[PDB]
Design a protein around this ligand. Structure first.
Ligand SMILES: CN1CCN(Cc2ccc(-c3ccc(CO[C@H]4CCC[C@@H]4NC(=O)c4cc(-c5cnn(C)c5)cnc4N)cc3)cc2)CC1
Ligand SMILES: [Cl-]
Ligand SMILES: [Cl-]
Ligand SMILES: [Cl-]
Ligand SMILES: [Cl-]
Ligand SMILES: [Cl-]
Ligand SMILES: [Cl-]
Length: 290
């Protein structure tokens, strides 16, 4: 009840503004959080669409959030706290309160960059820095024995200084911890980012995150293409069983593509660690002009 009390933010300190995004598993809203100093802080608010999905009490949700509040790394989003809102049937509904990242998610940013009004055309070297940024965040998380489990460009956020941070921890957990959700919440995992072994069995390790990182690198290199053009979601497991993998994007350095495809080796033990990936990418980025 020290870190558990500390993580909770009083609901009255929060004013909800507009909905920024709404999906099957929750919504993101703008909000304002009244400070101790009398000032207001702009925040994002993530709601969860919980309808009998959990097999633990809300304390469990809070203790996981408390652990994540301790994350301290430029490439990992740091949550501010959690607010609880009671349903009419007396069920607590948690709200994760995050600092507001003005540029939004990396995926959408990449797409906007392909329009005249958007961000300017993103140079190869900046694309590569995005990938290093994500590698550093995942290295930090994997060093703390966290499994991300929803690693995609849409769940990476852009800070005011164009630093990417890893976000959307809704499915994240410590290796060896129990499930918070029942069988219903793997449905949030997008199929085209799921490692072959995790499609075969309810099995997910840090090497499954490495696979998803390689898919994320590919999304970045293609400036936001959906993985596996021409392949439907329900075909993916067979496609991968036959040894097919993401194709090399146009203008992608051969070196970079080698790094990506090391992430999709059939045996998880043949995939690199995030430390190795990160160093390979830093080296590659260093080897190029300014
Ligand atoms: C199994 N355990 C059970 C218990 N769980 C507890 C728990 C569950 C979830 C989280 C958690 C942590 C971080 C996030 C943030 O994720 C972002 C990526 C995706 C959405 C979302 N977006 C924004 O947050 C955002 C959007 C915008 C913006 C700008 N422009 N536009 C259009 C939007 C501006 N700033 C932002 N910060 C969500 C949930 C933490 C703890 C653990 C697991
Ligand atoms: Cl409100
Ligand atoms: Cl942060
Ligand atoms: Cl978002
Ligand atoms: Cl596209
Ligand atoms: Cl492909
Ligand atoms: Cl190819």
């Amino acid at each position: 009840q020290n870190k558990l009390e500390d993580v909770v933010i009083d609901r009255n300190l929060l004013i909800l503004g507009k909905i920024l995004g709404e999906g099957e598993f929750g919504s993101v809203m703008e909000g304002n959080l009244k400070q101790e100093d009398g000032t207001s802080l702009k925040v994002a608010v993530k709601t969860m669409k919980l309808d009998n999905s959990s097999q633990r009490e809300i304390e469990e949700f809070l203790s996981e959030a408390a652990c994540m509040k301790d994350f301290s790394h430029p490439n990992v989003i740091r949550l501010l706290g959690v607010c609880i809102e009671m349903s009419s049937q007396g069920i607590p509904k948690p709200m994760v309160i995050l600092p507001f990242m003005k540029y939004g998610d990396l995926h959408t940013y990449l797409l906007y960059s392909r329009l005249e009004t958007g961000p300017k055309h993103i140079p190869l070297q900046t694309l590569l820095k995005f990938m290093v940024d994500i590698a550093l965040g995942m290295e930090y998380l994997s060093n703390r024995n966290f499994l991300h489990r929803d690693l995609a460009a849409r769940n990476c956020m852009l800070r005011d200084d164009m630093t990417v941070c890893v976000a959307d921890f809704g499915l994240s957990k410590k290796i060896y911890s129990g499930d918070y959700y029942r069988q219903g919440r793997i449905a949030k995992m997008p199929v085209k980012w799921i490692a072959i072994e995790s499609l075969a069995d309810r099995v997910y390790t840090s090497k499954s995150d490495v696979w998803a990182f390689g898919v994320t690198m590919w999304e970045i290199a293609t400036r936001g293409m959906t993985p596996y053009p021409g392949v439907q979601n329900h075909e993916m497991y067979d496609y991968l069983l036959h040894g097919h993998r993401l194709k090399q994007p146009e203008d992608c350095l051969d070196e970079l593509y080698e790094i990506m495809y090391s992430c999709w080796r059939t045996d998880p033990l043949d995939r690199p660690t995030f430390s190795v990936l990160r160093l390979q990418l830093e080296k590659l980025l260093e080897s190029l002009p300014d």
